[PDB]
Amino acid sequence: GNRRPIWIMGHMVNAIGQIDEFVNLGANSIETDVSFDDNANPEYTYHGIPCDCGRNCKKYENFNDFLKGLRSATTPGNSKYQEKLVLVVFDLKTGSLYDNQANDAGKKLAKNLLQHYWNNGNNGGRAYIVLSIPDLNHYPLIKGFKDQLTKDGHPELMDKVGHDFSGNDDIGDVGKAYKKAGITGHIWQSDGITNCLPRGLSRVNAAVANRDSANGFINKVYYWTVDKRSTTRDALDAGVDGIMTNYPDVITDVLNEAAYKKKFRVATYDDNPWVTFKK
Ligand SMILES: CCCCCCCCCCCCCCCC(=O)O
Ligand SMILES: CCCCCCCCCCCCCCCC(=O)O
Ligand SMILES: CCCCCCCCCCCCCCCC(=O)O
Ligand SMILES: O=P([O-])([O-])O[C@@H]1[C@H](O)[C@H](O)C(O)[C@H](O)[C@H]1O
Ligand SMILES: CCCCCCCCCCCCC(=O)O
Ligand SMILES: CCCCCCCCCC(=O)O
Ligand SMILES: CCCCCCCCCC(=O)O
Ligand SMILES: CCCCCCCC(=O)O
Ligand SMILES: CCCCCCC(=O)O
Ligand SMILES: [Mg+2]
Numbered sequence: 001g002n003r004r005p006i007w008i009m010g011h012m013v014n015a016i017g018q019i020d021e022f023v024n025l026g027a028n029s030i031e032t033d034v035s036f037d038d039n040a041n042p043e044y045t046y047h048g049i050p051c052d053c054g055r056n057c058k059k060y061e062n063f064n065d066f067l068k069g070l071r072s073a074t075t076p077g078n079s080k081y082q083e084k085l086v087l088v089v090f091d092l093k094t095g096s097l098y099d100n101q102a103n104d105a106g107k108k109l110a111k112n113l114l115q116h117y118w119n120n121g122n123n124g125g126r127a128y129i130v131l132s133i134p135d136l137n138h139y140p141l142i143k144g145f146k147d148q149l150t151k152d153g154h155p156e157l158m159d160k161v162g163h164d165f166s167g168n169d170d171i172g173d174v175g176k177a178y179k180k181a182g183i184t185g186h187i188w189q190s191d192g193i194t195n196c197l198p199r200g201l202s203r204v205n206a207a208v209a210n211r212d213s214a215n216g217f218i219n220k221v222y223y224w225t226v227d228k229r230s231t232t233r234d235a236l237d238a239g240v241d242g243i244m245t246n247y248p249d250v251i252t253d254v255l256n257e258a259a260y261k262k263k264f265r266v267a268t269y270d271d272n273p274w275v276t277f278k279k
Helices: 016-024 063-073 099-117 140-151 155-160 171-181 202-211 229-238 248-255
Strands: 004-010 029-034 087-092 128-133 161-165 188-192 220-224 242-245 264-266
Touching: 004 016, 004 087, 004 220, 004 248, 016 029, 016 063, 029 063, 063 099, 087 099, 099 128, 099 140, 128 140, 128 188, 140 155, 140 171, 155 161, 161 171, 161 188, 171 202, 188 202, 188 242, 202 220, 202 229, 229 242, 229 248, 242 248, 248 264
Parallel strands: 004 029, 004 242, 004 264, 029 087, 087 128, 128 161, 188 220, 220 242
Antiparallel strands: none
């Protein structure tokens, strides 16, 4: 059948200069960490120690600076436009926030994205955005984000926005979280572990099983963080849509192998990241 489109997601892309670095190695997507200040305002694109093996953990920008850089990379006609960069996953580090600030955090995020990424609707960046939340109890962040876009007069930008709960929770628990949030599509399901530690495929298989069942809730599945060819082949054999990596060129090389070229292709802007793939 048709080739499954694959998102090769550059991991921990937190300095503006790293956008080109990862995209030029073959990434069509990037993942970026978002720290929050004491008021639930996004503050930095900062991961900090501990981080993935072989990586500098401390590259960062003021969050709005990174957003303007991301906008340049994703706005057709810009000197720095990268046609290939089509999805951004914001890893919202909401661990520093009280649970009752989750909604506020969503609103502040929407304000920053609207102002600095989507440029108030004036020739904004075109990439699809996944809001990745590490704690199921922070689901009210989603409603906050939405409600803020709506108040600012850009509710249509939600068409470009999707969702992830990244905490490796039980899949049934994740589904219940979405049910509470009233979310019924644009769902990516992360599964993984730092590149420093070994992991099996049981939960990723279960996420794929949910995605491909008639009444499942997951649209796309991604595995993280994968820096090895063997692991890449395993994840692709398992049927994942996305692979998050410190080395996009490693993933690219595997996808360019004759056997894999026949079953997979690098996703482009016209592949809707919210739509479950069918052969
Ligand atoms: C919107 C200004 C961002 C800077 C925040 C500094 C003061 C903290 C605000 C408390 C959060 C209440 C949620 C408001 C959402 C909003 O309208 O920004
Ligand atoms: C290959 C034997 C098992 C892997 C050992 C765990 C290693 C931690 C993750 C980093 C592995 C990536 C391999 C080198 C990356 C590269 O291609 O430059
Ligand atoms: C982009 C070319 C696709 C069609 C190629 C037919 C399959 C043969 C591929 C053999 C592996 C060579 C890897 C080259 C990857 C590339 O740059 O396209
Ligand atoms: O893999 P994922 O669940 O999307 O989120 C990632 C992991 O949770 C881990 O914290 C890491 O290295 C990156 O900072 C995050 O992207
Ligand atoms: C109703 C019992 C909750 C089932 C588990 C839901 C998963 C996370 C949701 C946290 C919010 C708790 C609540 O108000 O339901
Ligand atoms: C829970 C976040 C962990 C990020 C990955 C850090 C790698 C392991 C470091 C350690 O030994 O502690
Ligand atoms: C939190 C739900 C976000 C999805 C936004 C798209 C549809 C919203 C329906 C509505 O207008 O209320
Ligand atoms: C480099 C791969 C070339 C295709 C050979 C086998 C084609 C097939 O699947 O029928
Ligand atoms: C497609 C609907 C997504 C949210 C519902 C999650 C579930 O199936 O329990
Ligand atoms: Mg991260």
